[PDB]
Design a protein around this nucleic acid. Structure first.
Ligand SMILES: Nc1ncnc2c1ncn2[C@@H]1O[C@H](COP(=O)(O)OP(=O)(O)NP(=O)(O)O)[C@@H](O)[C@H]1O
Ligand SMILES: Nc1ncnc2c1ncn2[C@@H]1O[C@H](COP(=O)(O)OP(=O)(O)NP(=O)(O)O)[C@@H](O)[C@H]1O
Ligand SMILES: Nc1ncnc2c1ncn2[C@@H]1O[C@H](COP(=O)(O)OP(=O)(O)NP(=O)(O)O)[C@@H](O)[C@H]1O
Lengths: 311, 311, 311
DNA sequence: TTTTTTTTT
DNA sequence: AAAAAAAAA
């Protein structure tokens, strides 16, 4: 939460600063987490300038060794937002954390985008209810976003729907490259008001249709790695929350399970957490954890009512 | 609805524009939704030209963050065409939406192509009746299209049959690759007069007989992903409506239902909606929803009269 | 009805053409309906050659969008051959269409092959009587074909039997693969004289005894899909007529009807029409429609006289 | 030296 | 029950 204007200090030119602004950098911490080469490659910058700049990023953000205790005390206050249902709150142990990346595993009709809606509204609850009190931006990439459902959840939690819709900064990606511009604009929007959550329904879906590899493929992974790193660039700074929804890739000639998310290893190593969603009978659905260091594997039911997620 | 001629501006060469025309691009928005690489790969184009071009696509079509409220106000006016019967209008909540992809699940004799006929006529009704007032193109791929039925529905809704048949741009695919050329020609036809609906009886049927995988298969999915993406390219621009009819693939060694549509995951993740059609006794048939974020699951009867869909 | 020699034009080598001849292709339209990959896979062909070839197939056969009206005007002239009895002519609304695939549903002693005989003779009637004036080829696969009955029908319609037998190109399949070679030879024979009708008594019967699946099965369906596609390749070109006779598969642990044709979904989705034949008392039999988009379900009697089909 | 994708009957 | 095949800096 530290604007570059604070770096308009110690002899840096304000127009040099406004050169820096165009990189999509808008906070001192973003400069602190910027690799030297990215900062060099942009034109009109001698490396010594970067010595000054990075010296200032160190000047504001400490980057040394830290006690495990202090880290624990700073871990004490992560919000971990409620999902809007109890059993998920038990699975996730209080729900999805801020400052992290999450994952929807499903085949279809698993209510993953549904959960994205309910989270999108429930971030706006007062913190006592677990909401981050943070405006929510929703990067849809299939156009499947439904305001009507947001009004339904608005009925569900008693807040006026108009207030809920006043936030929820919907955006509609098409090109794989477009998502990048949407990220830089996101970072541009982060400066003004503490947002709660980024959601992405199908970060991966564009990558199937565009990169018919291999390939390709080697380019596809090449792009995803940067995308996910940028998501870390946001999440490591402004908490809020990162949600990723993945289409599924069914194996052939496997054993006994015919699933696994597309995107290969690079997605898998990146996410702090992972989830998997099998349909039950009727509305009922089954969550099941993968790859969360915080938690033992667990599984649970939830119905998708008119209010969606519940019991 | 924005022709490339508007992009014949800001220093772009008119013959460069007429190079662009040949890509199947014919509208500014199509350029806006064009991935950078597809635009590069076509010959006679430096990437800087694409900087100009894309800069203009941004110059005409906004692509930034949007309020959920504004999206709601733009969601307020989607036509969602009547199906020509009341109970389906209740299931679908006013009928099939424009700007979307839909799905017929059936085994055979489920009247899916029947419904395609009735929709094909009923798009031509005045909007008060729910018709989009949009000419309809019908990409048949089994040759099963029957003008006679269109005359029957024409009796059903009192409009002269000749006027109905004056539209209905029937086209007869054979090769799997042929469907692609039919898509580019479709996009070419979109420029001239606002069409209502694309229909495809069996987008999938060619893919069985041609790709006897695996495979293949990995190529088959590779082709379908592009096909469906193109259908999104049309639907995200010109509304109208996309209808998909799928043959069924009966499981072996399953449990308890012996169905699921072919095409695997890639079809399933793509569609905004889904439908399923079990035969009842006599003419009567049963619709049942899958995978519509908008709607709770529901089911209903309808007879297939001489006028087809009704009660 | 367009021989490849017309494609012996625009720089194509005549020996390249005679390479093409060996594919079983013998008409320009067949090339037009040929998928790109099948044309590539055959040896001695660069893909650019296929660019030339397909460009010529487009050069002779239009493949663009068409008005529904024009399609109606071309639908106006389909012969729909008389079955040799009135009530069937009413059921089928003038009898079996050219350019289509048809289906015999029976258990045994339902006179399906009988009907195949009477059709086999009655195609030779003058068009005023509904005969296509087209030589008839009869692909038997159980050896049950009886010339004697053809002489009987010849008595029935007053034409000399010798003239009738002068056509009727009987062929006797054994292997499942053999039917394929018989198809390519059929296509080879199509060039010389407009034939009326292909008949196949038991396209499916070989598939039981050879593929004792599952399986198999997945291979069986894999083969049938190609077979049926080839039947479409013929029927979409040269009209005449396609007739399919199917043995029956009685269900176990069903409800209330213990039937359904073998071959699963893939046969079912393919046929333009379908028929079902229950024995009545004495000679009398009962036809009943399935899966004809053209027609409402109906049912009717007919006796199997010495002249077979009648009243 | 980097990089997994795909269900049918 | 039992089934392959797929490149490019
Ligand atoms: N009106 C409704 N009433 C009841 N349940 C509903 C209603 N609308 C949606 N649902 C439920 O929500 C599901 C929507 O599917 P969902 O999995 O949320 O979309 P998805 O996972 O994103 N699939 P995709 O189309 O690829 O995006 C339906 O299958 C129902 O279970
Ligand atoms: N000489 C005849 N006189 C009267 N009726 C006859 C005569 N020959 C045949 N039929 C009739 O035709 C039927 C022949 O059975 P049919 O159903 O035509 O053979 P199919 O259906 O092919 N059975 P399949 O042996 O498996 O091929 C007999 O059951 C009689 O009803
Ligand atoms: N003249 C008619 N009178 C009454 N009902 C009719 C008539 N014509 C068609 N139908 C009905 O419409 C159905 C046509 O099947 P339908 O499911 O529409 O074709 P389909 O689903 O595309 N099967 P396919 O052959 O693979 O394309 C028939 O089963 C009847 O229920």
């Amino acid at each position: 939460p530290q604007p570059i204007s604070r770096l308009e200090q110690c002899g840096i030119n304000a127009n040099d600063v406004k050169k820096l602004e165009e990189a999509g950098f808008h906070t001192v911490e973003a400069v602190a987490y910027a690799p030297k080469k990215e900062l060099i490659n942009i034109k009109g910058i001698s490396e010594a300038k970067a010595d000054k700049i990075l010296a200032e990023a160190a000047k504001l953000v400490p980057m040394g060794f830290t006690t495990a205790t202090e880290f624990h005390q700073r871990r004490s206050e992560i919000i971990q937002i409620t999902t809007g249902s109890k059993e998920l709150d038990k699975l996730l142990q209080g729900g999805i954390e801020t400052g992290s990346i999450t994952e929807m595993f499903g085949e279809f009709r698993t209510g993953k985008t549904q959960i994205c809606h309910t989270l999108a509204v429930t971030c706006q609850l007062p913190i006592d209810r677990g909401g981050g009190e943070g405006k929510a931006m929703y990067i849809d990439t299939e156009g499947t976003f439904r305001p009507e459902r947001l009004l339904a959840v608005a009925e569900r939690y008693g807040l006026s729907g108009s207030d809920v819709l006043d936030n929820v900064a919907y955006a509609r990606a098409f090109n794989t490259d477009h998502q990048t511009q949407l990220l830089y604009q996101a970072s541009a929007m982060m400066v003004e008001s503490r947002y709660a959550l980024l959601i992405v329904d199908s970060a991966t879906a564009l990558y199937r249709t565009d990169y018919s590899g291999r390939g390709e493929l080697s380019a596809r992974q090449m792009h995803l790695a940067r995308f996910l790193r940028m998501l870390l660039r946001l999440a490591d700074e402004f908490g809020v929350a990162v949600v990723i929804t993945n289409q599924v890739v069914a194996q052939v000639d496997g054993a006994a399970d015919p699933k696994k998310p597309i995107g290969g290893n690079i997605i898998a190593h990146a996410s702090t957490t992972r989830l998997y969603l099998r349909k039950g009978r009727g509305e009922t659905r089954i969550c099941q954890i993968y790859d969360s260091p915080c938690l033992p594997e667990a599984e649970a039911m939830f119905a998708i009512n008119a209010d969606g997620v519940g019991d």
